[PDB]
């Protein structure tokens, strides 16, 4: 739990589908298949964490997506091919995967001391909430700019979203390098249509425009524990 | 004896977009087989009816790589979520292989209080009354410039977009959902009408106004379809 | 036959390819199958025109395509979801689909007097001969440019044209709202070559800089009837 | 044993890229099936080899998601159409999946004769003589502004472009193809070379002339491959 | 082994990605598969060099990863038709597939004899190393550029790389005219924050912008012996 928190910590998104063969299986089989992933998850639950997150019906050609958190991506890399192994993992296919090491604050130094303050602050505690995660590109122009210029988009990026702090936790992975992308976005809410004006006030900014690549996917999901996803493929 | 399906107007209302295309192996059932499964959706769908509201559309045949799509009105996606896990589920879903998915919630109008007073009155008007007609679907992204202007630009955009509109406010049903944060669009448009020669001359007329070349992405996909009862169109499925 | 011509008349572009394991079928059912398509299309050629191309081996991913003529798009629809319903039609992956009206005439009107007579002409009669179709999106620029600028532009068009309207026959099909293309241009020919000079000829001129997706799929055949088409599969 | 091609030089005549990738059930055919097959094959060439050309090319392992390729010549497209859907009937046809699929008239030079006569003489030179040698193609279209421009402009164009290229005129074998209105590009370019090497350096020295800029899709897909006899490519396929 | 260095030599990268039909195989039938894998790449250990990489759950729809050496194209041509001519290749669909060669150093020499002194690195030692492979393709401006331009963007792209020079392993590989890509660029590292940072760095240079194509796809993979790999697949 000093994971999500903490820095030079690595984070993974990756996501699946369930294949049509699947429901070709006696349904038993199916159940016992489970529980392999199920020993499996504890049997790593050790060296890393990893949370489940249902996509089925939210998000396109995707059912089901896991976070999970390492010192290294080896441990992860391990991890992924083992579940992909096991009798339920040979019936999905790899949909989207993206890395990313959380890291120390960059901009936040440069900002008023009661700005600082206010960011202390993350989010409403919630179960079953919502989940989103939102991979960004910067264009080639943002890195060319200077400290003090990002600092002071940056700063209007954290002022636009001030009023939505506490229904919306957030938290921020590093991924130049690793992929085709710059940053991965992560959020949870209970309450949607807030996370729908947030994004809709930092799209007036000025440091919007940057982001070469916006989404493509936006993953939208609900936060559930993975037997109970598992569940609705055993019937 | 009835109910009240106060969702195809109010707001807060989240309005879900999925689309179906059907495998192959769909025909290598029996059709004795292939009506029960008819029947279990139906049944899904009425166990359903109270939580949300469910219409369908027939797109096979005028969209292409689709048959089928659904029109989901929920106060939350959790229920749509559920819904279309469960749908997804049944024999005939396992035989379905999920195309588009897009959310939005239906919100309260927001540049239309700085429109003149004539105009707001033909606003109250959304479409004449008709059975089984043609509906559209157009997802819309638009550009940063667009983002970046003030309310009184942005107003006269939409006045300037509202006005094309005017002729086409009865031969064209229309309804509008704010899907930014949601998915990889900022709204997504709906459209019924009998007259789709109409339909077609209505955008073209708004291609000629300022507002459409701030839209970053303008359908890709736009889907086509006919709005039907939900077993006449699965019944096309059962032979 | 007042369908290849006339105005209010919607025209619909459909392409599809044969999947592998149609072949992995004993021959007489496929012949059986060929049967079930002919008595289908027989039963709409009242309501509806249909014709055939043979795309097989000039187009990619594609080897057969139907041009549907309608008063009404239902009545295509309803053609369409019955061919793939057929024993044939299940082992057919849905390729391409357009639709657009036939309209009036727009900018003709303000053409001089002399080049209106000479588009009194508009093909030569050929049997079996090519068929290409190209679909086109305007940029926003052509959109707001006026009538007397636009007329001009297409004034400039007809003119680059005027020496192919012997050997290339052409239709013109209102695409805007019915799919992501603006136009549906569709054309017959005996002289293939002629029809590529005609092209870059009309690349020439100033409107061809607006066209934001020209071709994409630029779709090749022959046109034939639809018996000898299904003949090679009945192999 | 008695008789001319001239279709490899000759213009009006029509000349067709074909790709192919084979499918993983093929290989669950008998060895005996598959070396059988091959047979139908040669002898649809030969059925054939009066009335067209066709040269073979093994492309896997080099370009990605294609195995085999095609390049026939024509007087009629039609003959072409006919020929490859008969070959994809046949047994082995049948395991194949349509990759590709390009066309282009040869035509007669059209910028050569603004040329200097110093330049005129070394394009009499296509090519070393050479068996089994690689072979490259890439598909090319111009800008809008390439258009627009005039014909003494681009004659001063591919004056540089053909300037450029001359130190590698005896290393790689060239022929072009007027695509514009067959498909979705201007020009089909081939290229044959036992140095690769030299190939590649013939492409960085014209990334850096003028008319460069003006290839708004310079390959996607840039197919590269090995000359080679079509039974010895078929062979592979049959163990 | 006297390739991984030297000019001349061409260098592949292929990449491929397991069907799901492959664990529908008795395991009895996949160690045969594995072994025939093992036995063909023995045969041809004498005229190329191949590496093995796992790419699965690091790399998006890719399980497994060859780099391949070579004097000729052919020779790796032979290789890789053979390998996928086995019974595991008719269950791998091939996913990417890069060719370049490696050439001398072409704008070096007009570097501080200071910055040729720490160019003489290369990287640290390391087993099982993170690998990265980053295709690129640059922009008509860049090559319409003089020598002394490029020359002084280049030397601006290595004065950055510096501090990295021990951390990470690099190599160069000339793609122009075999594929749609200019560079292959290939990296081993232990150490993959500093890789990111690396990337981060490069970011914002001038040369960057002039990048019109920068992954896609960016490869993530561990660096393993190939029958280490086959086993996870033969269980
Ligand atoms: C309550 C909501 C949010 C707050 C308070 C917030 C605030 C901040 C702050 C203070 C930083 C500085 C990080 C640093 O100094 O390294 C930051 C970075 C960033 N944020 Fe947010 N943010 C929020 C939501 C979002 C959303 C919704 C998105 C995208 C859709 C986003 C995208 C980014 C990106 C890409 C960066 C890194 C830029 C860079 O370091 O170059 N943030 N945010
Ligand atoms: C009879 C037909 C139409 C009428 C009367 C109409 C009218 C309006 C009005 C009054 C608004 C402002 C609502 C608000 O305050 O949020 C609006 C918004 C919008 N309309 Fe339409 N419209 C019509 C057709 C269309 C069509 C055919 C499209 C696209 C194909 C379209 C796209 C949009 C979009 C994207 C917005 C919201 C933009 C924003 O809020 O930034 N409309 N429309
Ligand atoms: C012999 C060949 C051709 C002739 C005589 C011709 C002539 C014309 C004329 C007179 C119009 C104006 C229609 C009107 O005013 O209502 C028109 C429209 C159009 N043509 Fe052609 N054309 C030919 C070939 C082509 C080709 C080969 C293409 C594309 C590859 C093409 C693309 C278009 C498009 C996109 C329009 C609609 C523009 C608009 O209404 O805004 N035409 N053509
Ligand atoms: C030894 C190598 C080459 C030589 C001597 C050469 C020379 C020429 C010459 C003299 C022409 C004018 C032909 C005409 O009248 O249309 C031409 C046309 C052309 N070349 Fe090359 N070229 C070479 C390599 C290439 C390469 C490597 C490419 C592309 C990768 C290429 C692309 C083209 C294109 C697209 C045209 C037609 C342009 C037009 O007609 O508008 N050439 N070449
Ligand atoms: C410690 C790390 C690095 C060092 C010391 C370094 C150094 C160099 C040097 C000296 C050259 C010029 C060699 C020549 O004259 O051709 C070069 C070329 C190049 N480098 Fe790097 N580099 C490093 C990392 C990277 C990375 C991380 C990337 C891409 C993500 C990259 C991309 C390229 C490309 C595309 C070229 C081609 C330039 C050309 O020849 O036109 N390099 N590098």
Avoid at 13 to 28: C, K, S
Avoid at 113 to 133: C, D, F, H
Avoid at 159 to 178: D, F
Avoid at 213 to 230: C, N, W, Y
Wanted: glycine letters at 8%; a negative charge; aromatic letters at 10%.
């Amino acid at each position: 739990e000093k994971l999500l928190t903490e820095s030079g910590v690595y984070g993974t998104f990756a996501t699946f589908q369930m294949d049509h063969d699947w429901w070709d299986l006696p349904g038993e089989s199916r159940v016992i298949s489970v529980a392999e992933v199920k020993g499996l998850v504890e049997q790593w639950s050790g060296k890393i964490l990893v949370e489940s997150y249902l996509l089925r019906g939210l998000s396109d050609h995707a059912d089901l997506m896991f976070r999970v958190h390492a010192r290294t991506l080896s441990d992860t890399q391990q991890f992924l091919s083992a579940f992909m192994g096991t009798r339920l993992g040979r019936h999905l296919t790899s949909g989207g995967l993206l890395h990313g090491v959380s890291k120390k604050p960059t901009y936040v130094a440069g900002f008023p001391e009661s700005m600082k303050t206010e960011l202390q602050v993350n989010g409403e505690s919630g179960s079953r909430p919502y989940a989103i995660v939102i991979p960004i590109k910067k264009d080639a122009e943002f890195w060319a700019l200077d400290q003090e210029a990002r600092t002071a988009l940056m700063q209007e990026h954290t002022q636009a979203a001030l009023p939505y702090l506490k229904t919306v936790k957030r938290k921020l992975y590093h991924s130049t390098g690793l992929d085709d992308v710059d940053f991965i976005t992560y959020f949870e809410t209970e309450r949607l249509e807030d996370f729908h004006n947030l994004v809709r006030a930092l799209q007036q900014v000025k440091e919007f425009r940057h982001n070469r690549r916006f989404g493509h996917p936006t993953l939208l999901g609900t936060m559930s524990p993975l037997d109970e996803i598992l569940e609705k493929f055993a019937q």
